[PDB]
């Protein structure tokens, strides 16, 4: 008669077990972004100008003091690094990383995107079906700025490169039942992004990995979704009356 | 013109659908409109609907099935609105039922809708050898005996009052229309296009011109359910199946120096407000009496 | 133990070609190890088969069974999954396609009678399974009319052939 | 065979039946609104109607005082009955109390509840079932009959 | 007595699923006009009554603090007044109950 | 369509509930008082009495019991049976009911319209009488047929006659 149940699952955390790790956790990439680049509000109109856009961006590279120090830091840490050749490598990484999501291959995506970027592009589309393609690139990519941070705890240096890319993409997200959800397939919408890359310099391997994606505050709103949503009203307990803010 | 009754109905449906596609094509992209629910029951609810394709019935479906069945007329801002006419701009919505303390707007709409059903039955009851011309549906208050519809009949059908069986035949046809579930579709149509729809009916053309004179934009409202198209003023109930008790009471004669109009009167009650058999017969007798209220 | 109802929500269908009929949504939800009994829970499950979710909740709102509250929680939390995890708009457009009750793991105890005798007591646990499908509820079948019976009987008399004929 | 029996078997017998209604009636006088089982509240309605009738007799009538002595088990309620409840009810003859069916208690027993109260109590009003307004479609049709009937007759 | 044979599942299913033993549906469910919740036609709304009961308890709790003794009861009528209100001429001569919250909508002053 | 249950007093407003009660009440008095001329509304022909003929019974209400004494000093107990509203409802031909005697239908006391079936209310509307509580079938020969709608009174029985009584006894349960 004396038989009872087992296996009740709960997640409990304390400070003591976390401080008793014999081998400290090793992080391949930093968590946050050191400095967020602030593009001027006129980039939506400068992008239609060829000479003005290229010349202005080139000056910003050669005039920043902190950026030039970071560029020299990468050169000293690792030779054979060229700023001119970087955007073509960054452009190919961007295309390859998204094509991995189309094929839902996670093994390749781990090498392309970083640890802080992987959950954002996988979590939501885990059970969905997306179809992403590249058609054109109206403006060649430009390097915006380069930053570095020296963590004296272990001597690790991370080199973040911010790249502004004007891309023409065709995005269509399908529901798990096979019905269309977000966008069409044959519309080449023009999109602009400020992709931030990251590379570990102390690591002898040190692959170039995409770190984050920065959207300008004044960016146009994204295309509306097909599904209709309803924002629920405030749940009211019986002894509380509704108040209308104005 | 030589148009059989089947062809003239088909012509109007093709014309009505062609106008409907034009209105849909006027909106190339789906635009999101924020609708705030100012109803007593559920304040603070915000809807995000699509422009010109989202109807308040679809707005009600987000809440529960109770709003789908109880609600009859929606109140966009302060203007009465049908439950199958698509929304246009961001606004505030409220649902009105029969149970509310001021069902005056809903009561008028129900009285208008039942008049339209009688016109469909009357038009498609006489043989093709006789000509039936629908004039209008005069606006009578619910406090009167019953709703009335004016129909012009053939010149050789002047000395003919329908018998008791003939009057009951209209009710049986009306109940058959109630049996099938046919939604009411509301469309805003330009005045000249409306004249094309009602080319055969001289009286309808005069009615369209009179209504178009009250609006600077020369815009009129058309309502279609099933295969019948008619011009009416004000909104209508969303569904045909709302009516439960329907009956054609009697007919009356109004002779004018230019023409003779037949006034068909009938009394109806909805599913929600159905009455007892004893009360229904008492109300049916009053509907037999003449109703005279035009202005 | 067996847990296959939970894994039915992970099935991903291939994308639909344009022009094909819209695929109605299917939501699978269940609750494990409910203290209510298996047979008692069945009557509640039989009640709400084929009804829309809004009227299914209304019937279980006023039911006095202890399992009425348990089932109502399951439907409410399954409705939230349908409108959020799935792209099911019109949260009132769902109907209970299938509901049933299974048996869980029982605990055995000793029940005393007297004269030194005893009886084994079974603590009863049951599971509840519900599947919600987007769309209006299907129409319930009406009983066969007089003409339907006559048509079948005449058809039956017309299928007859000479038995052991040639 | 319970033909003609208007009373109900409650508690442990005829004596316990009175005492159960004695405690309920005392709570009803002090608080002016109590809720209990529907069967017990229905029985309590009959006594609460006649207790006010004894209160109207007066503070000097000996029978009323002895009757109120037994039923009001708390001795600070007798002055209240003869000086608050009795003076308040002078117009109506039998419309002293209201009974409405409260939903079932949220407990295991799932009993049928009822709420009993006195008219004009100093408490928030109960959500009484309100009838349809005269502007409703059915009422408007019937008002047409009355206006026509009163016009001729 | 003891059973003679085991009941087959075919017989048990007929008995356990007879229409009498099934749960009957309820057709007297309606939406409350005031709060929009569910209630039966002959039963007061559960949400509205719970709204009243919570307020009644607060009023009675204030009365208890105004009569410390267990056998202290007023000999006069009682009137409840909320914030921003003063007793009327007809309300004089009666005990006053003060509540800090604003007067509720459902509660009606006379 | 799961239509909700309804009753006559559900949708009636407080200002119309007294009106509807007056409306039906006035109809009953007009209908009952219009049937008080059986011989002035073209009745069926009346035949003289013949041997072996059967008359039409009534439907009455049992009030109570009283003691009664005869001229020889003996004591008897009499039961007060009151006829409240008795009208013949319908007549069935001889060959359609039994084949030997015709059937005459008699109703009971007046009841409310609001609690009867649709067919029952419709049946009385055609005749023009308020609904009855209990309806019984009487076997009557062809020479004693009465036009439906003819009122009947307690004078139908003259003192000195022996009569039968049929009614449901007192139910004592299980
Ligand atoms: Mg022992
Ligand atoms: Mg055993
Ligand atoms: Mg066992
Ligand atoms: Mg009894
Ligand atoms: Mg007991
Ligand atoms: Mg009683
Ligand atoms: Mg009995
Ligand atoms: Zn409520």
Domains of chain D: 10-121 (3.90.1030.10)
Is residue F164 within 8 A of residue F136, CB to CB? The reply is no
- Lay out the sheet containing B147-152: strands in order across: B133-136, B147-152, B260-270, B243-255
Are C53 and C75 spatial neighbours (Cβ–Cβ below 8 Å)? yes
From the list B273, B275, B277, which residue is nearest F118 (CB)? B277
Instruction: Report the residue of E21, E25, E37, E47 to disrupt the C interface, i.e. the one with the largest count of C CBs within 10 Å.
Output: E25
Give me the total of CB pairs closer than 8 Å, taking one residue from chain B and one from chain F: 22
Q: Which helix (H) or strand (E) holds F25?
A: helix F17-33
Q: What's the gap between Cα D133 and its chain centre? A: 27
What Cα–Cα distance (Å) separates residue A141 from each residue in A94, A163, B165, E97?
Answer: 11, 7, 85, 75
Distance E11 CA to ligand 3 centre (A): 19
Backbone angles phi, psi at A52, to 5 degrees: -65, -45
- CA gap E103, F43 in Å, rounded: 73
Would the annotation count C122 as a binding residue?
yes
Which ligand is closest to the CA of D6, given by its number? 4
Distance separating alpha carbons of residues A84 and A90, to the nearest angstrom: 11
The stretches of D81-152 forming alpha helices (DSSP H) are 86-88, 137-152
Q: Look at residues A73, F13, F69 and name the one whose alpha carbon lies nearest to residue D139.
A: F13
Residue in B253, F129, B293, F130 with CA at minimum distance from that of residue D144: B293
Residue of C nearest to E13 (CA): C39
Pairing mode, strands B95-96 and B73-76: antiparallel
> Cα torsion at B160, B166, B167, B168 (round to 10°)?
170
CB contact under 8 A, B65 and C92: yes
Q: Using DSSP bridges, classify how beta strands C117-123 and C107-114 pair: parallel, antiparallel or unpaired.
A: antiparallel
Ligand 1 centroid from CA C121, angstroms? 19
In this complex, how many residue pairs, one in chain A and one in chain E, have their CB atoms less than 8 Å apart? 9
- Alpha-carbon Rg of chain B, whole angstroms? 20
CB C28 within 8 A of CB C97: no
Helix axes C66-84, C53-61, angle to 10 degrees: 150
d(CA B170, CA B127): 14
Q: Are strands B185-190 and B219-225 parallel, antiparallel or unpaired?
A: antiparallel
- Nearest CA to A238 among E106, D115, E29? E106
**DSSP per-residue letters across E35-92:** T--EEETTS--HHHHHHHHHHHHHHHHHHHHH--STT---SS-EEEEETT----STTT
B202, B150 Cβ separation under 8 angstroms: no
Q: Which residues of E contribute to the annotated binding site?
A: 32, 35, 45, 48
DSSP string, D24-77: HHHHHHHHSEEEEEHHHHHHHHHHHHHHHHHHHH-SS-HHHHHHHHHH--STTS
Are there at least 3 beta-carbon pairs closer than 8 Å between A and F? no
Is C70 in contact with C62 (CB distance < 8 Å)? no
Among positive and negative, which fits the CA dihedral D54, D55, D56, D58?
positive
CB B134, CB B123: distance < 8 Å: yes
Integer Cα distance of B35 and B62 in angstroms: 12
Q: If you write DSSP's letter for every residue of chain C in order, what string do you get? A: ----SGGGGG--PPPPPTTSPPPPPEEEEEEEEESS-HHHHHHHHHHTTT-BHHHHHHHHHS--SHHHHHHHHHHHHHHHHHHHTS----TT-EEEEEEEEEE---EEEEEEEETTEEEEEEE--EEEEEEEEESSPPPPPPPP-HHHHHHHHHHHHHS---TT--
Q: In chain B, helix, strand, coil percent, each to 5?
A: 35, 25, 40
Nearest CA in chain C to E18: C43
Nearest to B32 among A224, A232, A244 (CB): A224
Contacts of residue E70, defined as CB under 8 A and 6 or more positions apart, other chains included, come to: none
**Separation of alpha carbons A132 and A102, rounded Å:** 6
Q: What is the enclosing helix (H) or strand (E) of E16?
A: helix E9-16
In angstroms, the separation between the Cα of residue D145 and the nearest Cα of chain F is 10
In angstroms, what is the span from residue D11 Cα to ligand 5's centroid?
A: 6
Element (H, E) at F42: none
- Ordered alpha helix ranges (H), chain A: 15-19, 43-46, 50-63, 65-77, 86-103, 106-112
Q: Select from C11, C15, C105 the Cβ nearest to the Cβ of A174.
A: C15
Q: How far is E6 from chain C (nearest CA, A)?
A: 19
Binding positions of E for Zn(2+): 32, 35, 45, 48
Instruction: Select the residue from A7, A179, A182, A183 to test the C interface by mutation, using most C Cβ atoms within 10 A.
Output: A179
Helices D137-152/B277-287 angle, 10° precision: 60
> If you count them, how many residues does chain C have?
166
D-contacting chains (≥3 CB pairs under 8 Å): B, E, F
d(CA D14, ligand 4 centre) in Å: 15
* Inter-chain touch E34–B40, beta carbons under 8 Å: yes
d(CA A228, CA C159): 55
Residue D98 CA: distances (Å) to CA of D46, D48, E79, F14, F17: 11, 10, 20, 18, 21
CA–CA gap between residue D20 and residue E24 (Å, rounded) = 35
Domains of chain C: 1-166 (3.90.470.10)
Of B31, B43, B46, the CB nearest to A231: B46
CA D107 / ligand 5 centre spacing (Å):
19
Resolution (A): 3.5
Chains that touch A (3 or more CB pairs under 8 A): B, C, E
Beta bridge partners of A146: A161
User: Determination method here?
Assistant: cryo-EM
Chain B residue at shortest CA distance from F124: B278
Chain B contact for F19, CB < 8 A?
Answer: no
Against chain C, the chains showing at least 3 CB pairs within 8 Å are A, B, E
User: What CA–CA distance (Å, rounded) separates E46 from C61?
Assistant: 11
Residue E54 to residue A238, Cβ atoms within 8 A: yes
Cα separations in angstroms, E79 against A137, B288, D124, E61, E104: 79, 56, 11, 15, 15
Chain B neighbors of E35, CB-CB under 8 A: 41
């Amino acid at each position: 008669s004396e038989k009872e149940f087992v296996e009740h699952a709960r997640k409990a955390g304390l400070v003591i077990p976390h401080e008793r790790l014999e081998r400290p956790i090793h992080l391949a990439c930093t968590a946050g972004i050191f400095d967020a680049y602030v593009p001027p509000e006129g980039d939506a109109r400068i992008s239609s100008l060829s000479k003005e856009g290229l010349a202005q961006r080139a000056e910003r590279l050669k005039k920043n003091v902190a950026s030039q120090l970071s560029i020299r830091k990468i050169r000293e840490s690792d030779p054979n690094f060229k700023i001119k050749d970087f955007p073509e490598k960054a452009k190919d990484i961007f295309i390859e990383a998204h094509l991995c999501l189309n094929n839902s291959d996670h093994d390749r995506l781990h090498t392309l995107v970083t640890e802080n970027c992987f959950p954002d592009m996988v979590w939501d589309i885990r059970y969905k079906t997306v179809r992403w393609s590249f058609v054109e690139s109206l403006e060649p990519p430009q390097v915006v700025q380069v930053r570095c941070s020296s963590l004296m705890n272990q001597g690790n240096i991370y080199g973040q490169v911010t790249v502004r890319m004007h891309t023409r993409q065709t995005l269509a997200i399908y529901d798990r039942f096979g019905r269309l959800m977000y966008g069409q397939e044959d519309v080449p919408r023009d999109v602009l992004e400020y992709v931030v890359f990251e590379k570990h310099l102390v690591d002898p391997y040190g692959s170039w990995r995409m770190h984050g994606k920065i959207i300008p505050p004044w960016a146009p709103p994204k295309q509306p979704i097909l599904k209709t949503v309803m924002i629920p009203g405030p749940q009211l307990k019986p002894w509380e009356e509704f108040e209308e803010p104005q | 013109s030589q148009l059989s009754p089947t062809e003239l109905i088909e012509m109007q449906n093709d014309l009505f659908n062609k106008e409907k596609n034009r209105q849909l094509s006027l909106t190339p992209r789906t635009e999101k409109i924020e609708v705030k629910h100012v109803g007593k029951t559920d304040p603070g609810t915000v809807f995000v609907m699509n422009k010109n394709i989202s109807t308040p019935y679809s707005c009600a479906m987000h809440l529960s099935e109770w709003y789908c069945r109880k609600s009859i007329l929606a109140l966009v801002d302060g203007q009465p609105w049908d439950m199958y006419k698509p929304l246009t701009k961001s606004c505030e919505i409220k649902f009105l039922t029969f149970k509310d303390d001021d069902p005056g707007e809903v009561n008028k709409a129900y009285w208008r809708s039942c008049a339209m059903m009688m016109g469909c039955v009357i038009e498609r009851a006489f043989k093709d050898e006789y000509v039936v011309s629908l004039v209008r549906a005069p606006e009578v208050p619910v406090i009167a005996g019953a709703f009335c519809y004016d129909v012009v009949l053939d010149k050789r059908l002047d000395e003919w009052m329908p018998t008791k069986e003939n009057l009951h035949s209209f009710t049986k046809d009306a109940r058959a229309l109630i049996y099938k579930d046919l939604p009411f579709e509301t469309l805003e149509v330009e005045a000249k296009v409306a004249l094309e729809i009602f080319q055969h009916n001289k009286y309808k053309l005069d009615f369209i011109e009179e209504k178009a004179s009250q609006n600077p934009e020369r815009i009129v409202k058309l309502h279609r359910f099933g295969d019948f198209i008619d011009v009416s003023e004000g909104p209508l109930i969303p569904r045909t199946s709302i009516c439960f008790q329907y009956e054609v009471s009697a007919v009356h004669n109004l002779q004018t120096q230019s023409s003779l109009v037949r006034r068909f009167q009938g009394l109806s009650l909805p599913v929600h407000l159905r009455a007892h058999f004893t009360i229904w017969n008492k109300l049916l007798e009053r509907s037999r009496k003449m109703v005279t209220e035009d202005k | 133990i067996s847990r296959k109802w939970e894994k039915k929500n992970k099935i991903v269908y291939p994308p639909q070609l344009p022009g094909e009929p819209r695929r109605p949504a299917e939501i699978y939800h269940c609750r494990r190890q409910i203290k209510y009994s298996k047979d008692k829970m069945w009557y509640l499950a039989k009640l709400i088969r084929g009804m829309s979710i809004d009227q299914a909740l209304a019937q279980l709102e006023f039911s006095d069974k202890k399992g009425a509250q348990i089932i109502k929680e399951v439907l409410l939390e399954a409705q939230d999954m349908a409108v959020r995890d799935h792209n099911v708009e019109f949260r009132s457009n769902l109907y209970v396609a299938e509901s049933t009750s299974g048996r869980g793991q029982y605990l055995k105890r000793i029940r005393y009678h007297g004269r030194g005798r005893f009886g084994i007591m079974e603590k009863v646990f049951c599971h509840y399974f519900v599947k919600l499908v987007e769309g209006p509820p299907p129409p319930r079948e009406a009983p066969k009319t007089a003409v339907a019976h006559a048509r079948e009987y005449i058809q039956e008399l017309r299928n007859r052939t000479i038995t052991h004929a040639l | 065979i319970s033909h003609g029996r208007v009373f109900r078997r409650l508690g442990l017998g005829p004596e316990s039946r009175i005492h159960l209604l004695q405690n309920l009636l005392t709570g009803l006088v002090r608080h002016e609104r109590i809720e209990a089982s529907w069967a017990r509240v229905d029985e309590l309605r009959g006594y609460a109607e006649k207790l006010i009738d004894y209160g109207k007799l007066g503070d000097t009538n000996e029978r009323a005082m002895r009757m109120a002595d037994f039923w009001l088990t708390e001795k600070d309620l007798i002055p209240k009955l003869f000086q608050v409840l009795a003076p308040r009810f002078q117009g109506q003859n039998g419309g002293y109390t209201r009974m409405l069916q409260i939903p079932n208690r949220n407990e295991q027993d799932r009993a049928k509840m009822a709420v009993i109260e006195y008219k004009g109590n100093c408490l928030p009003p109960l959500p009484l079932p309100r009838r349809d307004s005269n502007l409703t479609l059915l009422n408007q049709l019937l008002q047409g009959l009355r206006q026509d009937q009163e016009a001729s007759s | 007595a003891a059973p003679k044979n085991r009941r087959s599942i075919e017989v048990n299913r007929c008995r356990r699923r007879n229409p009498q033993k099934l749960i009957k549906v309820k057709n007297n469910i309606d939406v409350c006009p005031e709060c929009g919740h569910l209630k039966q036609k002959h039963i007061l709304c559960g949400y509205c009554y719970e709204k009243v009961r919570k307020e009644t308890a607060e009023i009675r709790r204030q009365m208890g603090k105004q009569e410390g003794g267990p056998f202290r009861a007023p000999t006069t009528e009682t009137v409840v007044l909320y914030s921003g209100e003063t007793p009327s001429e007809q309300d004089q001569g009666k005990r006053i109950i003060e509540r800090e919250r604003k007067r509720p909508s459902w509660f009606t002053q006379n | 369509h799961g239509k909700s249950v309804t009753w006559w007093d559900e949708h009636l407003s407080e200002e119309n509930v007294p009106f509807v009660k007056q409306l039906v009440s006035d109809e009953n008095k007009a209908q009952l008082a219009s049937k008080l001329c059986p011989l002035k509304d073209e009745p069926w022909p009346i035949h003289p009495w013949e041997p072996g003929s059967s008359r039409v019974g009534l439907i009455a209400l049992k009030l109570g019991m009283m003691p009664l004494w005869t001229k020889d000093g003996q004591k008897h107990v009499v039961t007060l049976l009151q006829v409240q509203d008795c009208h013949v409802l319908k007549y069935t031909p001889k060959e359609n009911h039994n084949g030997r005697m015709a059937a005459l239908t008699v109703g009971g006391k007046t009841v409310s319209h609001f609690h009867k079936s649709a067919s029952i209310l419709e049946f009385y509307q055609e005749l023009g009488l308020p609904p009855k509580q209990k309806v019984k079938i009487f076997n009557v020969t062809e020479n004693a047929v009465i036009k439906p709608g003819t009122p009947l009174y307690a004078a139908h029985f003259r003192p000195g006659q022996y009569v039968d009584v049929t009614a449901k006894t007192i139910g004592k349960g299980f």
